Design a protein around this ligand. Structure first.
Ligand code: HEM
Length: 154
């Protein structure tokens, strides 16, 4: 489903606030993912030793990864749907090396929404959350199509 410019602007105006401190947002989002759906942590050989939220919060390398994740996602969002070039390497690594099912991409989308909702009520009212959800649905739909092309049933 194609987003309107108005919807993209709601997405980008909350992303602008994420970008005040991407590192802290990335910690919150990865931690929320791992707490809400612990099976997702097991996909990270790099991080699955972390036992508690405290350990997660103290991990500089998890923080680093959260910045990488959110910056990659931000670049995708800023393309406003024209994200074919960005999705290719992402889909290929996530299909073939990391083996991340679409269901787990749903889980991180949920975590993103939850953190934005908590942190940014001024820029994440119902319409803005709907726009973000549409953007993440488009991301997951297009990633799923690439997964199929790449041979992964996701
Ligand atoms: C918004 C969705 C996501 C984005 C934008 C994202 C982005 C990235 C980026 C940019 C990398 C580093 C380059 C690469 O290997 O592609 C990465 C690595 C990785 N991703 Fe994701 N990712 C997302 C969701 C997920 C989810 C939900 C999982 C697991 C449940 C996952 C598992 C991994 C793993 C295991 C790595 C390798 C980490 C390491 O050992 O360095 N990703 N991701």
């Amino acid at each position: 489903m194609v987003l309107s410019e108005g919807e993209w602007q709601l997405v980008l105006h909350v992303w602008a606030k994420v970008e005040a401190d991407v590192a802290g947002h990335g910690q919150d989002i990865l931690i929320r993912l791992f707490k809400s759906h612990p099976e997702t942590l097991e996909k990270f050989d790099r991080f699955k030793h972390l036992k508690t939220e405290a350990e997660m919060k103290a991990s500089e390398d998890l923080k680093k990864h959260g910045v990488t994740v959110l910056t990659a996602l931000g670049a995708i969002l800023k393309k406003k749907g024209h994200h074919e070039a960005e999705l290719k390497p992402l889909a290929q690594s996530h299909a073939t090396k990391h083996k991340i099912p679409i269901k787990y991409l749903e889980f991180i989308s949920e975590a993103i929404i939850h953190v934005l909702h908590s942190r940014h009520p001024g820029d994440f009212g119902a319409d803005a959350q709907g726009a973000m959800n549409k953007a993440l649905e488009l991301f997951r739909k297009d990633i799923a199509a690439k997964y199929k092309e790449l041979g992964y049933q996701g």
